[PDB]
Design a binder for this molecule. Structure first.
Ligand SMILES: [Mg+2]
Ligand SMILES: [Mg+2]
Ligand SMILES: [Mg+2]
Ligand SMILES: [Mg+2]
Ligand SMILES: [Mg+2]
Ligand SMILES: [Mg+2]
Ligand SMILES: [Mg+2]
Ligand SMILES: [Mg+2]
Ligand SMILES: [Mg+2]
Ligand SMILES: [Mg+2]
Ligand SMILES: [Mg+2]
Ligand SMILES: [Mg+2]
Ligand SMILES: [Mg+2]
Ligand SMILES: [Mg+2]
Ligand SMILES: [Mg+2]
Ligand SMILES: [Mg+2]
Ligand SMILES: [Mg+2]
Ligand SMILES: [Mg+2]
Ligand SMILES: [Mg+2]
Ligand SMILES: [Mg+2]
Ligand SMILES: [Mg+2]
Ligand SMILES: [Mg+2]
Ligand SMILES: [Mg+2]
Ligand SMILES: [Mg+2]
Ligand SMILES: [Mg+2]
Ligand SMILES: [Mg+2]
Ligand SMILES: [Mg+2]
Ligand SMILES: [Mg+2]
Ligand SMILES: [Mg+2]
Ligand SMILES: [Mg+2]
Ligand SMILES: [Mg+2]
Ligand SMILES: [Mg+2]
Ligand SMILES: [Mg+2]
Ligand SMILES: [Mg+2]
Ligand SMILES: [Mg+2]
Ligand SMILES: [Mg+2]
Ligand SMILES: [Mg+2]
Ligand SMILES: [Mg+2]
Ligand SMILES: [Mg+2]
Ligand SMILES: [Mg+2]
Ligand SMILES: [Mg+2]
Ligand SMILES: [Mg+2]
Ligand SMILES: [Mg+2]
Ligand SMILES: [Mg+2]
Ligand SMILES: [Mg+2]
Ligand SMILES: [Mg+2]
Ligand SMILES: [Mg+2]
Ligand SMILES: [Mg+2]
Ligand SMILES: [Mg+2]
Ligand SMILES: [Mg+2]
Ligand SMILES: [Mg+2]
Ligand SMILES: [Mg+2]
Ligand SMILES: [Mg+2]
Ligand SMILES: [Mg+2]
Ligand SMILES: [Mg+2]
Ligand SMILES: [Mg+2]
Ligand SMILES: [Mg+2]
Ligand SMILES: [Mg+2]
Ligand SMILES: [Mg+2]
Ligand SMILES: [Mg+2]
Ligand SMILES: [Mg+2]
Ligand SMILES: [Mg+2]
Ligand SMILES: [Mg+2]
Ligand SMILES: [Mg+2]
Ligand SMILES: [Mg+2]
Ligand SMILES: [Mg+2]
Ligand SMILES: [Mg+2]
Ligand SMILES: [Mg+2]
Ligand SMILES: [Mg+2]
Ligand SMILES: [Mg+2]
Ligand SMILES: [Mg+2]
Ligand SMILES: [Mg+2]
Ligand SMILES: [Mg+2]
Ligand SMILES: [Mg+2]
Ligand SMILES: [Mg+2]
Ligand SMILES: [Mg+2]
Ligand SMILES: [Mg+2]
Ligand SMILES: [Mg+2]
Ligand SMILES: [Mg+2]
Ligand SMILES: [Mg+2]
Ligand SMILES: [Mg+2]
Ligand SMILES: [Mg+2]
Ligand SMILES: [Mg+2]
Ligand SMILES: [Mg+2]
Ligand SMILES: [Mg+2]
Ligand SMILES: [Mg+2]
Ligand SMILES: [Mg+2]
Ligand SMILES: [Mg+2]
Ligand SMILES: [Mg+2]
Ligand SMILES: [Mg+2]
Ligand SMILES: [Mg+2]
Ligand SMILES: [Mg+2]
Ligand SMILES: [Mg+2]
Ligand SMILES: [Mg+2]
Ligand SMILES: [Mg+2]
Ligand SMILES: [Mg+2]
Ligand SMILES: [Mg+2]
Ligand SMILES: [Mg+2]
Ligand SMILES: [Mg+2]
Ligand SMILES: [Mg+2]
Ligand SMILES: [Mg+2]
Ligand SMILES: [Mg+2]
Ligand SMILES: [Mg+2]
Ligand SMILES: [Mg+2]
Ligand SMILES: [Mg+2]
Ligand SMILES: [Mg+2]
Ligand SMILES: [Mg+2]
Ligand SMILES: [Mg+2]
Ligand SMILES: [Mg+2]
Ligand SMILES: [Mg+2]
Ligand SMILES: [Mg+2]
Ligand SMILES: [Mg+2]
Ligand SMILES: [Mg+2]
Ligand SMILES: [Mg+2]
Ligand SMILES: [Mg+2]
Ligand SMILES: [Mg+2]
Ligand SMILES: [Mg+2]
Ligand SMILES: [Mg+2]
Ligand SMILES: [Mg+2]
Ligand SMILES: [Mg+2]
Ligand SMILES: [Mg+2]
Ligand SMILES: [Mg+2]
Ligand SMILES: [Mg+2]
Ligand SMILES: [Mg+2]
Ligand SMILES: [Mg+2]
Ligand SMILES: [Mg+2]
Ligand SMILES: [Mg+2]
Ligand SMILES: [Mg+2]
Ligand SMILES: [Mg+2]
Ligand SMILES: [Mg+2]
Ligand SMILES: [Mg+2]
Ligand SMILES: [Mg+2]
Ligand SMILES: [Mg+2]
Ligand SMILES: [Mg+2]
Ligand SMILES: [Mg+2]
Ligand SMILES: [Mg+2]
Ligand SMILES: [Mg+2]
Ligand SMILES: [Mg+2]
Ligand SMILES: [Mg+2]
Ligand SMILES: [Mg+2]
Ligand SMILES: [Mg+2]
Ligand SMILES: [Mg+2]
Ligand SMILES: [Mg+2]
Ligand SMILES: [Mg+2]
Ligand SMILES: [Mg+2]
Ligand SMILES: [Mg+2]
Ligand SMILES: [Mg+2]
Ligand SMILES: [Mg+2]
Ligand SMILES: [Mg+2]
Ligand SMILES: [Mg+2]
Ligand SMILES: [Mg+2]
Ligand SMILES: [Mg+2]
Ligand SMILES: [Mg+2]
Ligand SMILES: [Mg+2]
Ligand SMILES: [Mg+2]
Ligand SMILES: [Mg+2]
Ligand SMILES: [Mg+2]
Ligand SMILES: [Mg+2]
Ligand SMILES: [Mg+2]
Ligand SMILES: [Mg+2]
Ligand SMILES: [Mg+2]
Ligand SMILES: [Mg+2]
Ligand SMILES: [Mg+2]
Ligand SMILES: [Mg+2]
Ligand SMILES: [Mg+2]
Ligand SMILES: [Mg+2]
Ligand SMILES: [Mg+2]
Ligand SMILES: [Mg+2]
Ligand SMILES: [Mg+2]
Ligand SMILES: [Mg+2]
Ligand SMILES: [Mg+2]
Ligand SMILES: [Mg+2]
Ligand SMILES: [Mg+2]
Ligand SMILES: [Mg+2]
Ligand SMILES: [Mg+2]
Ligand SMILES: [Mg+2]
Ligand SMILES: [Mg+2]
Ligand SMILES: [Mg+2]
Ligand SMILES: [Mg+2]
Ligand SMILES: [Mg+2]
Ligand SMILES: [Mg+2]
Ligand SMILES: [Mg+2]
Ligand SMILES: [Mg+2]
Ligand SMILES: [Mg+2]
Ligand SMILES: [Mg+2]
Ligand SMILES: [Mg+2]
Ligand SMILES: [Mg+2]
Ligand SMILES: [Mg+2]
Ligand SMILES: [Mg+2]
Ligand SMILES: [Mg+2]
Ligand SMILES: [Mg+2]
Ligand SMILES: [Mg+2]
Ligand SMILES: [Mg+2]
Ligand SMILES: [Mg+2]
Ligand SMILES: [Mg+2]
Ligand SMILES: [Mg+2]
Ligand SMILES: [Mg+2]
Ligand SMILES: [Mg+2]
Ligand SMILES: [Mg+2]
Ligand SMILES: [Mg+2]
Ligand SMILES: [Mg+2]
Ligand SMILES: [Mg+2]
Ligand SMILES: [Mg+2]
Ligand SMILES: [Mg+2]
Ligand SMILES: [Mg+2]
Ligand SMILES: [Mg+2]
Ligand SMILES: [Mg+2]
Ligand SMILES: [Mg+2]
Ligand SMILES: [Mg+2]
Ligand SMILES: [Mg+2]
Ligand SMILES: [Mg+2]
Ligand SMILES: [Mg+2]
Ligand SMILES: [Mg+2]
Ligand SMILES: [Mg+2]
Ligand SMILES: [Mg+2]
Ligand SMILES: [Mg+2]
Ligand SMILES: [Mg+2]
Ligand SMILES: [Mg+2]
Ligand SMILES: [Mg+2]
Ligand SMILES: [Mg+2]
Ligand SMILES: [Mg+2]
Ligand SMILES: [Mg+2]
Ligand SMILES: [Mg+2]
Ligand SMILES: [Mg+2]
Ligand SMILES: [Mg+2]
Ligand SMILES: [Mg+2]
Ligand SMILES: [Mg+2]
Ligand SMILES: [Mg+2]
Ligand SMILES: [Mg+2]
Ligand SMILES: [Mg+2]
Ligand SMILES: [Mg+2]
Ligand SMILES: [Mg+2]
Ligand SMILES: [Mg+2]
Ligand SMILES: [Mg+2]
Ligand SMILES: [Mg+2]
Ligand SMILES: [Mg+2]
Ligand SMILES: [Mg+2]
Ligand SMILES: [Mg+2]
Ligand SMILES: [Mg+2]
Ligand SMILES: [Mg+2]
Ligand SMILES: [Mg+2]
Ligand SMILES: [Mg+2]
Ligand SMILES: [Mg+2]
Ligand SMILES: [Mg+2]
Ligand SMILES: [Mg+2]
Ligand SMILES: [Mg+2]
Ligand SMILES: [Mg+2]
Ligand SMILES: [Mg+2]
Ligand SMILES: [Mg+2]
Ligand SMILES: [Mg+2]
Ligand SMILES: [Mg+2]
Ligand SMILES: [Mg+2]
Ligand SMILES: [Mg+2]
Ligand SMILES: [Mg+2]
Ligand SMILES: [Mg+2]
Ligand SMILES: [Mg+2]
Ligand SMILES: [Mg+2]
Ligand SMILES: [Mg+2]
Ligand SMILES: [Mg+2]
Ligand SMILES: [Mg+2]
Ligand SMILES: [Mg+2]
Ligand SMILES: [Mg+2]
Ligand SMILES: [Mg+2]
Ligand SMILES: [Mg+2]
Ligand SMILES: [Mg+2]
Ligand SMILES: [Mg+2]
Ligand SMILES: [Mg+2]
Ligand SMILES: [Mg+2]
Ligand SMILES: [Mg+2]
Ligand SMILES: [Mg+2]
Lengths: 76, 144, 134
RNA sequence: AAUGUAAAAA
RNA sequence: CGCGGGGUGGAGCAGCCUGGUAGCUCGUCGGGCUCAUAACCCGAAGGUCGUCGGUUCAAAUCCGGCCCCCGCAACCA
RNA sequence: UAGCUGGUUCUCCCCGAAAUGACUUUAGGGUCAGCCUCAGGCGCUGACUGGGGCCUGUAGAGCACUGAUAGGGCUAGGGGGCCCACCAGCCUACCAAACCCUGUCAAACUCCGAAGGGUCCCAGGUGGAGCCUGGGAGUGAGGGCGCGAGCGAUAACGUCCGCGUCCGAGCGCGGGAACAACCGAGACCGCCAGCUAAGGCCCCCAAGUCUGGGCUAAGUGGUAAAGGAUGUGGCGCCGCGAAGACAGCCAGGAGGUUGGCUUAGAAGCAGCCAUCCUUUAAAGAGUGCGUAAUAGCUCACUGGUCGAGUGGCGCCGCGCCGAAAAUGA
RNA sequence: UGAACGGCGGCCGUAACUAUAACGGUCCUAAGGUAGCGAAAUUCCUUGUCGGGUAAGUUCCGACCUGCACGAAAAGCGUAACGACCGGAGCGCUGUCUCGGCGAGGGACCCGGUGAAAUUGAACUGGCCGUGAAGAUGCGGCCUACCCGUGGCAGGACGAAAAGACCCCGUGGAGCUUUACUGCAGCCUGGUGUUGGCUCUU
RNA sequence: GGGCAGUUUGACUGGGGCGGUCGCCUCCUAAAAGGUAACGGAGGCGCCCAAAGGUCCCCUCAGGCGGGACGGAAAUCCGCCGGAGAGCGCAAGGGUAGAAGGGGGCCUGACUGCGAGGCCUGCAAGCCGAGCAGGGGCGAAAGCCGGGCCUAGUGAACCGGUGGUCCCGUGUGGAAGGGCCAUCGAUCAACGGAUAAAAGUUACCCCGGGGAUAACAGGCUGAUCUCCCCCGAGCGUCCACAGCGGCGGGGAGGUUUGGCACCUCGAUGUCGGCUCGUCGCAUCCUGGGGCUGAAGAAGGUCCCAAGGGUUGGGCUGUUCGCCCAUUAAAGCGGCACGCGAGCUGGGUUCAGAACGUCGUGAGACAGUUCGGUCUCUAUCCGCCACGGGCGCAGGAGGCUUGAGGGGGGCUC
RNA sequence: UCCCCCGUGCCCAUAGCGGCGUGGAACCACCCGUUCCCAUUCCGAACACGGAAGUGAAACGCGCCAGCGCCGAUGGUACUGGGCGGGCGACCGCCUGGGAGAGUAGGUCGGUGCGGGGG
């Protein structure tokens, strides 16, 4: 019957959708690879995690052959 | 082992078990109707595994019953006798005086040295097959 | 064949793709009910078909068993079925064309297909090549 | 460091 | 069905765990001593490594399914 | 000692669960979370809804990837045959890589891709909504039903999850003959008042033996399948017909021919392979029976008579057979 | 060191028909089960096969041996006599039976005297077919049925009795076991106290 | 050092044991957020690397075709097509050449002191992280570096080891010994880890509980079993259905074996026999038919039909089955496998004992063998009989009608 | 405002593959050379410097062509929030709102922003 196995659920995916206000440093997206590329005011960590770089608003940009991007349009 | 031939019986088992043995028949009796040879089994708690084993057993015996009858019709064709002793021969090959001789056709010859090399045609053709089929061809066309 | 292992049962929902048209031969036999058709079924139909018209025309078979049909061996509840006792079946939603015939009189193919129907669990229909094409 | 059968004395 | 072991020259066994080259005894074959055979002496040949897949630069060797043989187990009511 | 079983005593009022998750020598026990309640505090935010933005890979479909797959084409490789050896050549109603055409399958395949769902913003929403801190809990065996999957056997009042829902705690009321969870509906108390819901309105039993148009002759209805049949009614299509059909009845129904071949025999009639003509108004190198092989009978087809319709096929409604069980229906 | 605990092989081949294998090959062991016995108080397949007995014999007796899984002091094989031991057969005799009948006495039954028990939710406690927690006097539909007792039968009241002994559960209990753990008694052991003198010796 | 003593001897589990499993990662199941179970389908981890790391600089795969001394499908060279099917240490997935991939120069940031704000979450854990300070590495610089393309490669606390320092030092000074910092000892793998330390047996057994859970029976189910149909390859010399029916297909029944675990564990007594039966019909006989490959007699096959009938022995506890002698036939099922408040108790299923077998052992066996306590009193329903009461719209004696039941039902 | 060219962005194939044609004044490229800076695991191929001559062959720039590639409706359908209705079921049917994929008709060899040189 050798089969009763699996591994923990990692609860990844988009953590902050477009339009949502965000504090600097808080996380935008956890992902397997780069299903989302960083972009303006958004850094990326060892696991490919995208995190806002300054208080602002999240917005997503698709750029075809160049992939999708997550941006934080600042304001204060 | 065609299903149409053998009959299978079910019946409670002899020996230990609890109420399970009394109320649950797991023993099996698979008799072969034509050959009459029967067989019974009940070594396992299950009816199917007994019905299964009792059948693999019957297979073995029915194979050994077909091998016995497979003997008379594949060994009686060899020869109804053949002592290999003295005089049991049917054709002598004398190398001293140089002469073979088929004691069946009474036919003779003068070259044992070549015959024991391939010259069987002269023998089988004219005389051999003749007397061979003769003793059976005169048996049917008269009384047999 | 190849694939891998055994496979979930799924469900025979509406005959959405469970429909078709003739694409080979003049006559065809289409299904009317959803069912898992066994290899032993497909074959028995196909053979009984030629068996009918000896040295006859040519038959086509458009359904093909790729689904492993499992089965536990007279016991209780452990693991997934060793299965495959009936081995393999083909999914058939009502409306799909299964068997094509060709190169025989109508009454010669109205019988061949009439029979292949019987060897099948479901109710089926025979068809002329209407006139609907692409 | 064994063995060698079975047809020959006017 | 469950757990364990095994399948390698014609016979019987090594080699595998630790992948790179398959070894032992017997038999077989050629040549010797003998009047001749055996014994004995000198040579030589012979193996899909059960089967289908997988890993690897590479599989007898490691991984998986199947067929075959062996042993154990099949208990409580 | 008892993580077990039993037992736990007056009344009225308000609210009102859980049978899930995580860990547990844990699995009928516990700790924390979830859900209930009370107190104080905040006060339009709450469920649900409108508009807008972003996130998604199911249903369906698809073959572009990973694989599976029927037929054909083209074509390496191998196999058989001609031919041979210096190796070369052609054939190939054998198997078949790649490729292409047609046709398809896939939870662990996706060029695509819904409905929907999630979340944030704005607005409606004062509700036994919501949020913050605390006191007290119980629950941690659920069950059925609808839907979506796994397991199972596209078995089980089976089993395991997901979204609902009802019983649990509404075995209170109405319907369903009776019957927790199906249909209707949330019982504060009283009334010999009224409208309804599901379901019903011939008698037991309240209310139409109501109205209009059909179908069904089985007690179907009053609970079963493949499959079988000149059941009955209905729409459609093709064909025959007063230039005479369908049915029955009068007559011929053949010649070479006894078809070639298989075979003991195969004379239209076991099987195999099949595509003449002619007397003529018509008769098929033959529908069935009869044979050992034939002759005999018949249809097919033509003539006459009759005198008005007839035959096949597709579709729908209801019905018939298929249909055997043990205390009395 | 075995009348100490204990143990006592596998595969393949070979015969003046076939079958078998006295013989051989090879691998492994500490050594590979000898005599005697053997479908047995041991045999799974099994009612093995053959013979005996019987009209007919899964038992029984005698054999054969492919001993699932005998075997030599947890003794092997026998053995006269003995046995309220266990199995098979026969003669005698029978109500054991075909198959039951009659008769006797002590109860049962009726009258007078004395007078219990388990049990008991309450009862105004019928049949069928359904139904319901899946086996209904108590729900539904239908059938049946005047009220109350006495002698009898045991199908039901999932009848009574005993908080199921079987099964599982409880980080329950207890008896037993050992090369489970940890201890203890006991036995062995060095130092030292009780413990002294003389002499040789390294 | 079991002579004796105190104890341990896990959990999950479509009953339990046996088998398997236990933590971590990948994918599917998962129903387009997240999450989601089963002893559901499939696979990996318990490491590795001082280059396989940092930075700067440069280069771009696999494959296909053509051409080339060894080469020969494939080594290395050249040309043309080729956007990623290669590579990224290792399972899978996501991602990726506008590098995360191949090569080179210098290099050690596989830094210390921190850490805004988050992800995830019952707890505790796990994860991401801009920037500030120190002193650095590569770069001209903008900058990048707090290991590795990413997600596994792991272990609370306790107890102890080694190194170090602003700490404490039992009247004071030292010392002993602690604290703090650093790091070490986990197949605590039953992987949230009971002790520093632990296996079996009970049929000699006991208590507490459970119909939360198995063995009997009922129930649901109908795989299995029995019976019956659809198709018609073929057999039957000729003739597919006299009699048969390949390969397939649809059902009925609830007698078998199972599945499930619904009532009953403050008890529903288990096999066989005996006694007494009653019901079903899918009919063994007898009665009536159709067909026949039915001359007749006798059969074969299907149809109708329960009214009655359906023997005695041998063997075994047997049911079953074999056998003997008959018969018109020696039917099959239901009724808790009908019936133990009716009987038996041979079998199963307590304690004794023995054999083979397994175990060091105590013991154990759907293996065997001999032995082994079956409970006088019927309240109610039901049943067999027999009375008392009242009724039957004057009272009484005798004789009767038959609604409605019951019995009988055989065959040579 | 206009035209050509250079550099650099924006969307991300209707921008691409390929076939034909045109451009050297300007710009760009190839191009001459390898002393110097720099460079090859060999080689001025690449990287680099110094640069006349020649050329527009290559590369690139612009423009045409629809064979490949790519884009691709409308109409209808599958599926489906929500609400119902029929059968033993494996299933099926209606109302309401949403609505694919494939395929048919067609479309495309691009559109634009900032700076600079030039008529
Ligand atoms: Mg799992
Ligand atoms: Mg992408
Ligand atoms: Mg970083
Ligand atoms: Mg037959
Ligand atoms: Mg027996
Ligand atoms: Mg026992
Ligand atoms: Mg027992
Ligand atoms: Mg039973
Ligand atoms: Mg039973
Ligand atoms: Mg084919
Ligand atoms: Mg079970
Ligand atoms: Mg297996
Ligand atoms: Mg002489
Ligand atoms: Mg061999
Ligand atoms: Mg080695
Ligand atoms: Mg070594
Ligand atoms: Mg040799
Ligand atoms: Mg030699
Ligand atoms: Mg020699
Ligand atoms: Mg030599
Ligand atoms: Mg040689
Ligand atoms: Mg191998
Ligand atoms: Mg073998
Ligand atoms: Mg063998
Ligand atoms: Mg065993
Ligand atoms: Mg066991
Ligand atoms: Mg057992
Ligand atoms: Mg036991
Ligand atoms: Mg036991
Ligand atoms: Mg026990
Ligand atoms: Mg209140
Ligand atoms: Mg309330
Ligand atoms: Mg507990
Ligand atoms: Mg709590
Ligand atoms: Mg508000
Ligand atoms: Mg997509
Ligand atoms: Mg789909
Ligand atoms: Mg394409
Ligand atoms: Mg592929
Ligand atoms: Mg691949
Ligand atoms: Mg060709
Ligand atoms: Mg070739
Ligand atoms: Mg050649
Ligand atoms: Mg060649
Ligand atoms: Mg050729
Ligand atoms: Mg899919
Ligand atoms: Mg996937
Ligand atoms: Mg859609
Ligand atoms: Mg929403
Ligand atoms: Mg108000
Ligand atoms: Mg409330
Ligand atoms: Mg509230
Ligand atoms: Mg609030
Ligand atoms: Mg509270
Ligand atoms: Mg609590
Ligand atoms: Mg719990
Ligand atoms: Mg539960
Ligand atoms: Mg529910
Ligand atoms: Mg449903
Ligand atoms: Mg399951
Ligand atoms: Mg299904
Ligand atoms: Mg169900
Ligand atoms: Mg409750
Ligand atoms: Mg409620
Ligand atoms: Mg009730
Ligand atoms: Mg009523
Ligand atoms: Mg109800
Ligand atoms: Mg009620
Ligand atoms: Mg209710
Ligand atoms: Mg309604
Ligand atoms: Mg009514
Ligand atoms: Mg019906
Ligand atoms: Mg039906
Ligand atoms: Mg019907
Ligand atoms: Mg029908
Ligand atoms: Mg008919
Ligand atoms: Mg006409
Ligand atoms: Mg006219
Ligand atoms: Mg007519
Ligand atoms: Mg007439
Ligand atoms: Mg005539
Ligand atoms: Mg006539
Ligand atoms: Mg004529
Ligand atoms: Mg005619
Ligand atoms: Mg005539
Ligand atoms: Mg003719
Ligand atoms: Mg004629
Ligand atoms: Mg005649
Ligand atoms: Mg129709
Ligand atoms: Mg119709
Ligand atoms: Mg009938
Ligand atoms: Mg009855
Ligand atoms: Mg000795
Ligand atoms: Mg021994
Ligand atoms: Mg032994
Ligand atoms: Mg021999
Ligand atoms: Mg020795
Ligand atoms: Mg022995
Ligand atoms: Mg004896
Ligand atoms: Mg015996
Ligand atoms: Mg015997
Ligand atoms: Mg045994
Ligand atoms: Mg025996
Ligand atoms: Mg026996
Ligand atoms: Mg016998
Ligand atoms: Mg005999
Ligand atoms: Mg006898
Ligand atoms: Mg005898
Ligand atoms: Mg006897
Ligand atoms: Mg023997
Ligand atoms: Mg023997
Ligand atoms: Mg033996
Ligand atoms: Mg055996
Ligand atoms: Mg055994
Ligand atoms: Mg034995
Ligand atoms: Mg022995
Ligand atoms: Mg001994
Ligand atoms: Mg003795
Ligand atoms: Mg004696
Ligand atoms: Mg005595
Ligand atoms: Mg005695
Ligand atoms: Mg006597
Ligand atoms: Mg008697
Ligand atoms: Mg008396
Ligand atoms: Mg008395
Ligand atoms: Mg007395
Ligand atoms: Mg008295
Ligand atoms: Mg009464
Ligand atoms: Mg009934
Ligand atoms: Mg009820
Ligand atoms: Mg009730
Ligand atoms: Mg009752
Ligand atoms: Mg009621
Ligand atoms: Mg009643
Ligand atoms: Mg009555
Ligand atoms: Mg009395
Ligand atoms: Mg009495
Ligand atoms: Mg009674
Ligand atoms: Mg009594
Ligand atoms: Mg009773
Ligand atoms: Mg109890
Ligand atoms: Mg424990
Ligand atoms: Mg001591
Ligand atoms: Mg001493
Ligand atoms: Mg001492
Ligand atoms: Mg002393
Ligand atoms: Mg002393
Ligand atoms: Mg010790
Ligand atoms: Mg000890
Ligand atoms: Mg179960
Ligand atoms: Mg179990
Ligand atoms: Mg056990
Ligand atoms: Mg276990
Ligand atoms: Mg899981
Ligand atoms: Mg592994
Ligand atoms: Mg690397
Ligand atoms: Mg480059
Ligand atoms: Mg290639
Ligand atoms: Mg090439
Ligand atoms: Mg080449
Ligand atoms: Mg080449
Ligand atoms: Mg070459
Ligand atoms: Mg060379
Ligand atoms: Mg080669
Ligand atoms: Mg080459
Ligand atoms: Mg190249
Ligand atoms: Mg080229
Ligand atoms: Mg790419
Ligand atoms: Mg690819
Ligand atoms: Mg790679
Ligand atoms: Mg890698
Ligand atoms: Mg990947
Ligand atoms: Mg890029
Ligand atoms: Mg590198
Ligand atoms: Mg690099
Ligand atoms: Mg390097
Ligand atoms: Mg900060
Ligand atoms: Mg933080
Ligand atoms: Mg936390
Ligand atoms: Mg906590
Ligand atoms: Mg930083
Ligand atoms: Mg700094
Ligand atoms: Mg950083
Ligand atoms: Mg790396
Ligand atoms: Mg990196
Ligand atoms: Mg790297
Ligand atoms: Mg990840
Ligand atoms: Mg501690
Ligand atoms: Mg400090
Ligand atoms: Mg001091
Ligand atoms: Mg000092
Ligand atoms: Mg420190
Ligand atoms: Mg371990
Ligand atoms: Mg644990
Ligand atoms: Mg542990
Ligand atoms: Mg403790
Ligand atoms: Mg320990
Ligand atoms: Mg432990
Ligand atoms: Mg004892
Ligand atoms: Mg005790
Ligand atoms: Mg219960
Ligand atoms: Mg439980
Ligand atoms: Mg029972
Ligand atoms: Mg019951
Ligand atoms: Mg039927
Ligand atoms: Mg035949
Ligand atoms: Mg025939
Ligand atoms: Mg069926
Ligand atoms: Mg039953
Ligand atoms: Mg059952
Ligand atoms: Mg239960
Ligand atoms: Mg349950
Ligand atoms: Mg009770
Ligand atoms: Mg009782
Ligand atoms: Mg009994
Ligand atoms: Mg009984
Ligand atoms: Mg009759
Ligand atoms: Mg007759
Ligand atoms: Mg006759
Ligand atoms: Mg006759
Ligand atoms: Mg006759
Ligand atoms: Mg007669
Ligand atoms: Mg009839
Ligand atoms: Mg009948
Ligand atoms: Mg009898
Ligand atoms: Mg007889
Ligand atoms: Mg008779
Ligand atoms: Mg008879
Ligand atoms: Mg009879
Ligand atoms: Mg029956
Ligand atoms: Mg009976
Ligand atoms: Mg009973
Ligand atoms: Mg039963
Ligand atoms: Mg019984
Ligand atoms: Mg009794
Ligand atoms: Mg009894
Ligand atoms: Mg009793
Ligand atoms: Mg007794
Ligand atoms: Mg008995
Ligand atoms: Mg006995
Ligand atoms: Mg017993
Ligand atoms: Mg006991
Ligand atoms: Mg005992
Ligand atoms: Mg037994
Ligand atoms: Mg006994
Ligand atoms: Mg008594
Ligand atoms: Mg009662
Ligand atoms: Mg009663
Ligand atoms: Mg009467
Ligand atoms: Mg009567
Ligand atoms: Mg009567
Ligand atoms: Mg009667
Ligand atoms: Mg201008
Ligand atoms: Mg050209
Ligand atoms: Mg130049
Ligand atoms: Mg120089
Ligand atoms: Mg210079
Ligand atoms: Mg320089
Ligand atoms: Mg320069
Ligand atoms: Mg040019
Ligand atoms: Mg170009
Ligand atoms: Mg033009
Ligand atoms: Mg185009
Ligand atoms: Mg549309
Ligand atoms: Mg249905
Ligand atoms: Mg359905
Ligand atoms: Mg729409
Ligand atoms: Mg579209
Ligand atoms: Mg283009
Ligand atoms: Mg533009």
């Amino acid at each position: 019957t050798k089969n009763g196995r699996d591994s923990q659920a990692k609860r990844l995916g988009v953590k902050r959708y477009e339009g949502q206000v965000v504090r600097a440093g808080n996380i935008l997206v956890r992902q397997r690879g780069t299903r989302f590329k960083p972009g303006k005011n958004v850094g990326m960590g060892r696991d490919f995690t995208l995190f806002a770089l300054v208080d602002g608003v999240v917005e997503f940009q698709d750029r075809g052959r160049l992939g999708r991007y997550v941006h934080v349009r600042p304001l204060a | 082992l065609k299903p149409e031939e053998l009959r299978i019986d079910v019946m409670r088992a002899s020996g230990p078990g609890g109420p399970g043995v009394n109320t649950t028949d797991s023993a099996v009796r698979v008799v072969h109707l034509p050959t009459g040879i029967t067989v019974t089994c009940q070594t396992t708690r299950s009816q199917i595994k007994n019905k299964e084993l009792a059948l693999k057993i019957l297979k073995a015996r029915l194979y050994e019953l077909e091998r016995k009858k497979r003997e008379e019709e594949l060994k009686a064709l060899r020869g109804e006798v053949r002592p290999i002793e003295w005089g049991s021969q049917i054709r002598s090959y004398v190398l001293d005086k140089n002469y073979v001789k088929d004691h069946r056709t009474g036919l003779m010859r003068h070259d044992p040295e070549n015959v024991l090399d391939g010259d069987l045609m002269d023998l089988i053709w004219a005389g051999l097959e003749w007397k061979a089929g003769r003793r059976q061809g005169t048996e049917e066309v008269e009384a047999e | 064949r190849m694939k891998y292992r055994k496979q979930q049962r799924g469900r025979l929902k509406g005959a959405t793709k469970g429909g078709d048209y003739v694409a080979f031969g003049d006559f065809g036999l289409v299904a009317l009910e959803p069912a898992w058709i066994t290899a032993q079924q497909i074959e028995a139909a196909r053979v009984a078909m030629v068996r009918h018209f000896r040295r006859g025309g040519k038959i086509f078979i458009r359904i093909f068993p790729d689904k492993p049909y499992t089965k536990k061996p007279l016991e209780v509840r452990m693991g997934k079925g060793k299965g495959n006792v009936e081995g393999y079946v083909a999914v058939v939603k009502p409306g799909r064309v299964m068997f094509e015939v060709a190169g025989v009189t109508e009454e010669q193919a109205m019988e061949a297909l009439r029979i292949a129907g019987h060897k099948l669990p479901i109710k089926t229909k025979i068809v002329r090549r209407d006139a609907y094409d692409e």
